[PDB]
Amino acid sequence: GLRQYYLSKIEELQLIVNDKSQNLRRLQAQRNE
Amino acid sequence: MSEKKQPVDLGLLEEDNWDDDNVEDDFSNQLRAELEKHGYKMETS
Amino acid sequence: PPGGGEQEPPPPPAPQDVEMKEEAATGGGSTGEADGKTAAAAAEHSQRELDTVTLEDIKEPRFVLRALRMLPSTSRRLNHYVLYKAVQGFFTSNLPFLEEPMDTEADLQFRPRTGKAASTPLLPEVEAYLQLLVVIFMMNSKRYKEAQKISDNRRALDLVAAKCYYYHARVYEFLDKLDVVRSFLHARLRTATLRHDADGQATLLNLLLRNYLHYSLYDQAEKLVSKSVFPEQANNNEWARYLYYTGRIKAIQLEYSEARRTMTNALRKAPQHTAVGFKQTVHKLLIVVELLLGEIPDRLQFRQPSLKRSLMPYFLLTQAVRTGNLAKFNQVLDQFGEKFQADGTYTLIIRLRHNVIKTGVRMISLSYSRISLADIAQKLQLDSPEDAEFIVAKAIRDGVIEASINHEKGYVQSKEMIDIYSTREPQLAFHQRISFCLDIHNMSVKAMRFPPKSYNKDLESAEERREREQQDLEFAKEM
């Protein structure tokens, strides 16, 4: 089918997500303290 | 931990607290002694 | 018989025992960690691979028939280790170690695992004396590895395969062709860098450049336009050699300003280990290029025990170049030309005459104020006074010295330029490092807040003390 195309797209999005998550997790602490 | 390896050409077949100045070795080319130069120059004149 | 009964027995058992937790336990933990979770680098144990490579470098039938098709087979693997140890203690073990991964239930079900297992035979087979594991047979094992390379799912396989196709290159390096290795690498590069970003845009670049220069073709087109210049993930080990290669590439094309900084950064990225193999070369070039660029001294005297014996010619060389004399330069070249040719550096230092003559003329200009050219030739031994006029004219052209010359007379007179403090240049000098000192503070502060974490403890004063305080207040207010 067309699975490869979809795999590529979804993989790229998920690969990006983690960096953002990380760079926000640090930010929350400072505000809490 | 401490992988610290490099592939090629390890070689070469296996102090001083005074800060180094280049000039010290310049006259290491010759003039072993101010003495010798003065002593063996003055006699001419 | 008596001699081989006390020191030969020890070699068998103790290494096996200490390996049972070094790579067997490592493989067991990686299978359930690297292939069991998405920690990647964390549970990939790239540093465990590292240690088990470096230690085994200076250090198979049992470990090749590992089985894990079913849960009883995976459990068996560990008792079968001891069974093979007992067999070795009782009996003598043994090409016939390549079909086992297809047999003996060998179903790791993780490529990340079978890859490292296959590579571990390859490394000893590569290091099996100089036999090369019967030559192409090692390559054939790596051909099997290359089949594995095309197997797939790279949430671990990628950073496992990096080392694989790094030793793969060494295999051909020690033997036959490299051109078709270049073809393969070129293909493999775009085989990557298209699956979004996958890394390897660091190792493959260095592998391609390692012998692209060795074949002596200084192609640079793709390096200026390479999109893999910025993998940004190099473990601070790849980055050094990549910067060294690009620095030499840049310096060989009459570009000196940027090569110095980039390759000095590369040199100072080097680790602390005792081995000084590549540091010898980078230092040697880092001081040739500094002699070329203007006349920076470079004489930050190096007398360290490791480097002392090697760099004996170069010390003599700098000694001649610093002084304005020119016969010394020839007396050094005609003496060490063969040695420099063996080092692959004759072409760079053969063009040093212009630097020598510039230093000499600048020194003459700074020393005197009014000197006839009938003595410049004698002092700099050009064997002719007339061409000294052209030399001085070219020097004046480039702003080396502002001295004028009375051609009809012959004497050269120089201007007097003092009080540089009022000039604008010291402000530029101060600004250039104000920028650096402001950058370092932000760089340091940026990484300070990462370690502070797990600070969920947030209590003010108490929970049940409020009721007691309210009761006491009410009792006090009653009376």
From Swiss-Prot, chain A:
It is found in: Cytoplasm; Nucleus. Component of the 26S proteasome, a multiprotein complex involved in the ATP-dependent degradation of ubiquitinated proteins. This complex plays a key role in the maintenance of protein homeostasis by removing misfolded or damaged proteins, which could impair cellular functions, and by removing proteins whose functions are no longer required. Therefore, the proteasome participates in numerous cellular processes, including cell cycle progression, apoptosis, or DNA damage repair. Component of the 19S proteasome regulatory particle complex. The 26S proteasome consists of a 20S core particle (CP) and two 19S regulatory subunits (RP). The regulatory particle is made of a lid composed of 9 subunits, a base containing 6 ATPases including PSMC5 and few additional components. Component of a complex with USP49 and RUVBL1. Interacts with PRPF19. Interacts with TRIM5. Interacts with NDC80. Interacts with PAAF1. Interacts, in vitro, with the thyroid hormone receptor (in a thyroid hormone T3-dependent manner) and with retinoid X receptor (RXR). Interacts with ERCC6. Belongs to the AAA ATPase family. This is 26S proteasome regulatory subunit 8. The lineage of its organism: Eukaryota, Metazoa, Chordata, Craniata, Vertebrata. The gene is PSMC5. The chain holds residues 19 to 51 of 406 of the full protein.
From Swiss-Prot, chain B:
GO terms for cellular component: cytosol; integrator complex; nucleoplasm; proteasome complex; proteasome regulatory particle, lid subcomplex; protein-containing complex. GO terms for biological process: double-strand break repair via homologous recombination; mRNA export from nucleus; proteasome assembly; proteasome-mediated ubiquitin-dependent protein catabolic process. Keywords: Nucleus, Proteasome. Expressed in limb bud, craniofacial primordia and skin. Pfam families: DSS1_SEM1 (PF05160). The keyword Nucleus applies. InterPro entries: DSS1_SEM1. It is found in: Nucleus. Component of the 26S proteasome, a multiprotein complex involved in the ATP-dependent degradation of ubiquitinated proteins. This complex plays a key role in the maintenance of protein homeostasis by removing misfolded or damaged proteins, which could impair cellular functions, and by removing proteins whose functions are no longer required. Therefore, the proteasome participates in numerous cellular processes, including cell cycle progression, apoptosis, or DNA damage repair. Component of the 19S proteasome regulatory particle complex. The 26S proteasome consists of a 20S core particle (CP) and two 19S regulatory subunits (RP). The regulatory particle is made of a lid composed of 9 subunits including SEM1, a base containing 6 ATPases and few additional components. Belongs to the TREX-2 complex (transcription and export complex 2), composed of at least ENY2, GANP, PCID2, SEM1, and either centrin CETN2 or CETN3. Component of the homologous recombination repair (HR) complex composed of ERCC5/XPG, BRCA2, PALB2, DSS1 and RAD51. Interacts with the C-terminal of BRCA2. Belongs to the DSS1/SEM1 family. This is 26S proteasome complex subunit SEM1. The lineage of its organism: Eukaryota, Metazoa, Chordata, Craniata, Vertebrata.
Swiss-Prot record, chain C:
The keyword ATP-binding does not apply. Residues 240-419 form the PCI domain. The modification Phosphoserine is found at residues 372, 384. There is a cross-link at residue 21 (Glycyl lysine isopeptide (Lys-Gly) (interchain with G-Cter in SUMO2)). Pfam families: PCI, Rpn3_C. Gene3D superfamilies: 1.25.40.570, Tetratricopeptide repeat domain. Keywords: Isopeptide bond, Phosphoprotein, Proteasome, Ubl conjugation. GO terms for molecular function: enzyme regulator activity. There is a cross-link at residue 21 (Glycyl lysine isopeptide (Lys-Gly) (interchain with G-Cter in SUMO1)). Residues 1-52, 454-479 are annotated as: Disordered. GO terms for cellular component: cytosol; extracellular exosome; extracellular region; ficolin-1-rich granule lumen; membrane; nucleoplasm; nucleus; proteasome accessory complex. Residues 455-479 have a biased composition (Basic and acidic residues). InterPro entries: 26S_Psome_reg_C, CSN3, PCI_dom, TPR-like_helical_dom_sf, WH_DNA-bd_sf. PROSITE patterns: PCI (PS50250). Residues 1-15 have a biased composition (Pro residues). Coiled coil: none annotated. One of its GO terms (biological process) is regulation of protein catabolic process. SMART domains: PAM, PINT. Component of the 19S proteasome regulatory particle complex. The 26S proteasome consists of a 20S core particle (CP) and two 19S regulatory subunits (RP). The regulatory particle is made of a lid composed of 9 subunits including PSMD3, a base containing 6 ATPases and few additional components. Interacts with UBQLN1 (via ubiquitin-like domain). Interacts with ERCC6. Component of the 26S proteasome, a multiprotein complex involved in the ATP-dependent degradation of ubiquitinated proteins. This complex plays a key role in the maintenance of protein homeostasis by removing misfolded or damaged proteins, which could impair cellular functions, and by removing proteins whose functions are no longer required. Therefore, the proteasome participates in numerous cellular processes, including cell cycle progression, apoptosis, or DNA damage repair. Belongs to the proteasome subunit S3 family. This is 26S proteasome non-ATPase regulatory subunit 3. It comes from Homo sapiens.
